Symmetry: C6
Subunit: 210 residues, 6 copies
């Protein structure tokens, strides 16, 4: 990835074994849980398209997901080529890092103004990963219900984990979300939440059901 040196300029540096190990271990252990995407966005700080290609190709399993990612990147490159018809300006395949040289990528990312091919490739990969995570949700939100003896903490944590997996975003707060949350609880906490009144925060609901 491109970093900043002590002279004050952007100079390319090789990708480190630590970053590669971190990414491979994360993908192998956490599978495609929703928090992998922030991990991908953090490990790819200032990455060139070649670095992102290395990170994607290094993954051993989940080849169906990687094929979906490849198809999504191709679709995004086609859309970019349609929206941007014609140093040489980049094309979709050049941004994808399959028809361009590392030197050209570094020249683009250091140009004034910069042409962040790495950022665009990261956005395409992030769209692909969002689709993959949304497809790999283990269960639907409508089937999350508190057990007969399950504490409110466990039920709420499972409900919000599922709702993060489904919508592919942690920020899943909605009025219908709260209604579904209160509906699926056990009757003991259901009555308390019903009597708590509208507009209550999740903190107050957890305190009341503690």
């Amino acid at each position: 990835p491109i970093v900043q040196n002590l002279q004050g300029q952007m100079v390319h540096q090789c990708i480190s074994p630590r970053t590669l190990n971190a990414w491979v271990k994360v993908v192998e252990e956490k599978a495609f849980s929703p928090e992998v995407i922030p991990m991908f966005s953090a490990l790819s700080c200032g990455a060139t398209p070649q670095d992102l290609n290395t990170m994607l190709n290094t993954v051993g399993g989940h080849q169906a997901a990687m094929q979906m990612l490849k198809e999504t990147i191709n679709e995004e490159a086609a859309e970019w080529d349609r929206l941007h018809p014609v140093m040489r300006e980049p094309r979709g395949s050049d941004i994808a890092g399959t028809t361009s040289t590392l030197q050209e990528q570094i020249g683009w990312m250091t140009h004034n103004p910069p042409i962040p091919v790495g950022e665009i490739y990261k956005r395409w990969i992030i769209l692909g990963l969002n689709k993959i995570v949304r497809m790999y949700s283990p269960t639907s939100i409508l089937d999350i219900r508190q057990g007969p003896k399950e504490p409110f903490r466990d039920y709420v944590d499972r409900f919000y984990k599922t709702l993060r997996a489904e919508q592919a975003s942690q920020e899943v707060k909605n009025a219908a979300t709260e209604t579904l949350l209160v509906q699926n609880a056990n009757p003991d906490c259901k009555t308390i939440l019903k009597a708590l009144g509208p507009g209550a925060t999740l903190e107050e609901m957890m305190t009341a059901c503690q």
Copy 2:
């Protein structure tokens, strides 16, 4: 996080995978014990709101706590907007890192005088974490007493651990707290402490009951 180079200028640095792994392991293994807050304040030395959001979103489980944290940050941002009506001035959401880009944050944190958006966001996150840790107390302070044969050392350890968890702070010393400690002590140690009289430090009580 913004760091200082050998030249002597504040520049951005990519967030290291080592810090991310440390924070993830700490949250996974420490649950929400009161010692997590100093760890978060240490790992985030000089971080920007983007880095804080990365560190928060990378947490795997405990989604209810993250939702409470998000709601608390929203409340604090609303309060900040109310107290500050209207480079572009940072709004509550911009400080929270929802509608802000990296360049804007770095310009804010390198301005003269600096607008410490990172510090403000860290304060809001610290408030949310304090509330979460307080909520995560396994038992109240009034429910802990020394056992029939428990050494006074372990009893004081448990008492002060519970006291730290209850108030989400370590410095919770009070005359009422000392009276509670001597009240719940074993009858032999209670008699010894009563004979020792008021004004005795914790060290003297520990020495006497040895």
Copy 3:
């Protein structure tokens, strides 16, 4: 390898023990899976031919594969010698790091215009590794068929992993490959895929068969 310091010139630095340990661990663990080649291209970023020889000779086991690699490198060196009739210009063996000193390799890797002996040797080694990986595939692509109760997701995983093993590249799918994919599926999923019609993406096939 050769890296750039703050003075502004390429300088040679010793190969770090971290890279060597990572490469040895990768070879010992993953055997010759198709993802070894991206790891080799990543760990050897800017490595002079001496470093490539160090990385190749450090591998303990799999001596047949290393002998095939040696023969392939010799053949490529002979072709290079034939195509290039005769600072001294490099030869095939000089590029292969057998009859060249470290100083000569540094000079070749740093002149203007550069003679990327490291990159040429890397391409030869990657060709040899492609041959090895293609030879080491456990199964043929015609032996992959979905089981009576195996999910379509796992069937696609196996199919595309084996396909990457054979062609030694991720870009291995084709129209005939898509026909093979739909033909080898279980009849229940085969009917759905047939009803989905031509032009269907892998995403739609995965969604429909669930």
Copy 4:
């Protein structure tokens, strides 16, 4: 901690996760053995009071020890305030790191002449740690006596470890301690040591009694 950069200036640096993990592991595993204090003085080299507070607060267990440490710090700060009647001059709490900011601490630590607030706070913490270590001695010195078949080396190891714990120092050997050491030895070794006469060092005693 404040460290000297390559340009030759004393600049503030964030405290690395490795030091924090090392200190946490040392406290967690070694309890409060006498060797912890040298580890504390080595890990916290050049630290400002904020870093010392972070390193103290990060400890999870042993809350009674931390309470005693806080009491000792308060006593020493009161003494400092008494002895110093009144850039702004530091106070007891300012040195302790509770009513001071990072900028003020850095200014004090880098003023000419320096006001070593970090060193003074470290001395107070060392006093507290010495008190805790002395309190946490499992056994008294007089209770170390050689077994019927116990080797002399292990007996001397136990004796000197116990003596090290008590006086909160390693250089605790003395003529009275030498007499105590020769008193509790086994009669077979006791007669040999008595015949060896005064003036014999520990090496000669160990050699004679093997």
Copy 5:
């Protein structure tokens, strides 16, 4: 070892603990398999004679091998003294690292032109290690015969591993080597090798014997 700094000169650096740990672990775990020599030549890149002595004296076991290494080094030093009749010019014992100081070694390795005492010492140590590796071959190559149900790949693995051990070098290719390889195979593969015809490469033999 000696490295290159940002000032552009050659200056000394202490041998890092990671290098020492890597060397000790490699030597202990891998015994004296032929891949140790590439590891030794990679870890000691640019090492001074004192660094080589530190790396050799740190090994715990295999003391007979270390004594043979010392004998070989002494013989080579005597030869060097014989071949060179007589800042002081180096002698055999100075390159051996027994009668030279670190300052003198650095002056030798940084003189104009450099007198690579480190490289000469490393060559002597490599000759000694080659002798030890040859002596540590578990079995003779003539006893390697393919099993009744052993795959030809595993037979080639064992054959070439043993042959590399015997010569302490990877260059074991020969017409007699190929004849010995084909003679020891099972008749089922021996007939196929005979039918393949002379002059075939190893890859063709592997593919035809599958």
Copy 6:
């Protein structure tokens, strides 16, 4: 330890936790085997007396050995004081690091001409460690005997390991050493060794009995 910065000057640096962890682990695991002294020499590269004291105090067990080391240090300091009757020149105590501040030590180790208190202190510590390792020898050299069927390799390994321990030095080859080596060999090997002829090298003996 005092190291050289990029500007080209000697400045102090806090002892890194990696060095301390390595030193403590080695001392705890290997006990006082003769290979510890090279490790201590490597890890203490360029250290001040304060760093040497830090590394000595951090050792938890084996307090008898540490007391012997302290006695040896005191004796050497007394000898230094006698040999050198009285920036202030360093006395024995100041060299030992008990009565000298870090500023004085840095001023001493960076003066022109240098006064290497660290080197002298390391010499004293190495003398003490040699004495400790010599005392800690598990067995005598005369008791080293070959088993009836124990391979000659293991016999020579044990013999030279013990003889290295016996004299606290690896350079232990001698005429009497070889005489005892051939005297304690098994009769089957003794016949071959006797018929081999005087003056034979160790490699010839190993090959003859292999």
